[PDB]
Amino acid sequence: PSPLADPSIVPDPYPVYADLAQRRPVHWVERLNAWAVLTYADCAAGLKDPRLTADRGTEVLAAKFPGQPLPPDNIFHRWTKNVVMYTDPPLHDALRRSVRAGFTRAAHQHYDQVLQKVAHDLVASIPAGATEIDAVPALAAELPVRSAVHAFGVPEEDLGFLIPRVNTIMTYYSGPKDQPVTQEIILEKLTDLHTYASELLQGMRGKVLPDTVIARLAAAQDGLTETTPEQTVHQLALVFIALFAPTTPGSLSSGTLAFARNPRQVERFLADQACVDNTANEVLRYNASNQFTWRVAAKDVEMGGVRIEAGQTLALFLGSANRDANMFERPNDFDLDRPNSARHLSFGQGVHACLAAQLISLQLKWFYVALLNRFPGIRTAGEPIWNENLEFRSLRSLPLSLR
Ligand code: HEM
Numbered sequence: 001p002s003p004l005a006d007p008s009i010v011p012d013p014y015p016v017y018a019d020l021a022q023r024r025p026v027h028w029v030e031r032l033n034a035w036a037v038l039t040y041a042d043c044a045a046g047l048k049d050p051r052l053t054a055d056r057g058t059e060v061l062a063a064k065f066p067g068q069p070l071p072p073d074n075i076f077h078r079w080t081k082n083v084v085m086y087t088d089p090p091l092h093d094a095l096r097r098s099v100r101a102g103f104t105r106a107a108h109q110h111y112d113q114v115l116q117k118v119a120h121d122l123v124a125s126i127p128a129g130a131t132e133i134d135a136v137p138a139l140a141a142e143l144p145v146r147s148a149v150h151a152f153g154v155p156e157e158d159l160g161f162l163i164p165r166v167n168t169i170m171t172y173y174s175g176p177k178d179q180p181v182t183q184e185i186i187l188e189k190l191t192d193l194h195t196y197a198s199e200l201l202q203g204m205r206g207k208v209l210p211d212t213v214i215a216r217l218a219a220a221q222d223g224l225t226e227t228t229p230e231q232t233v234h235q236l237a238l239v240f241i242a243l244f245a246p247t248t249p250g251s252l253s254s255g256t257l258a259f260a261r262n263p264r265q266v267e268r269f270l271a272d273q274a275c276v277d278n279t280a281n282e283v284l285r286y287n288a289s290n291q292f293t294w295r296v297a298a299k300d301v302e303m304g305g306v307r308i309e310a311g312q313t314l315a316l317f318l319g320s321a322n323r324d325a326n327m328f329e330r331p332n333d334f335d336l337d338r339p340n341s342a343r344h345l346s347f348g349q350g351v352h353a354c355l356a357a358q359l360i361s362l363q364l365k366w367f368y369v370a371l372l373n374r375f376p377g378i379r380t381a382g383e384p385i386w387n388e389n390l391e392f393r394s395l396r397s398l399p400l401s402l403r
């Protein structure tokens, strides 16, 4: 019976992942209704294997809410079948092109400057007499919300509507454990994000800051020719979910912990710009926030000596792949001098590689620039405590001393 379904692995899964990558690199996890895939080689190729489809909302819903299917007209199916995350090419590619205006080279030139300032301002807000901080609520949870506002264009005044709704929706992705929130409630909040997205663009909600992702997307709508208004609304809903997911906080907090525990890496960062430049990727490699991602077999495939039949579900363990010693020597070392950290799988790979990958790496880079030049002596001030979630894994508490 798979140790991947044991809640006790979440604080430190890596010894279990390493053992299973060796002995059981592909194996069945009953609680996921899926084949777990543990090695870098199999995860990276699986992400780019056209025999594995991203059209998986049916299968994954059946895994998470067995006995509770939904019809094709239900918001769950209309959303999944009309967003980049859960579509294959060619539709995927039309949907991705339709959001290009938010993510151009010029746009990221602007976001680089916004994020530098946002992170600067966050860290500068920590009072002089503060030696202790819980880096989760104070910093890791906070930076992504300030980025959502200033770089993405989510109105600040609408955060009270969005934050709790995304937190509810995100319980869908609770890993191999009982669902804490009913399907009915999740679908209601998913519906609510669609209403909000459409009303935001109509000017019925908050004010979107200029030159942000959402402002750019809004201005692009008149020129779209291969997608529909409903598709834009579906895609915004996904964007809201991704913006307020625990992914970015977990990356910030797990990287902060890594620095706290590895002071010579602080020294490296302050000594060598190449180590700065590699910080986002080494942090992303060191702990994938999304530890596994889902696929379905569109055709029979063979992986890890297992024949996976068309229609079966797979869980590609990005978090295990990132610490596979065959790809990353001494994979449990947090090492800014590592030469291949950019090979991590935390943003996936290929067709569905994270749309926000550059935005998030800029956010991480500027955070650590600000934090570590202010407070190079960061250390633990108690036990870091993890959320009870393997799928989207993150710290709930990170007590630190700043000096
Ligand atoms: C550290 C933070 C984040 C991490 C670790 C993360 C991780 C991922 C991963 C693993 C995928 C690929 C999943 C798969 O193929 O199965 C993905 C895709 C995606 N990401 Fe992120 N992501 C983050 C932040 C964000 C944010 C803030 C947004 C907001 C826009 C976002 C938007 C997306 C979208 C739209 C896709 C789908 C792209 C496609 O299907 O073409 N990501 N991300």
Ligand SMILES: N[C@@H](Cc1c[nH]c2ccccc12)C(=O)O
Binding pocket: 085, 241, 242, 245, 247, 290, 292, 293, 294, 295
């Ligand atoms: N892993 C998710 C896809 C995903 C990646 N990043 C996310 C952020 C938020 C929500 C979902 C996602 C899935 O297989 O369904």
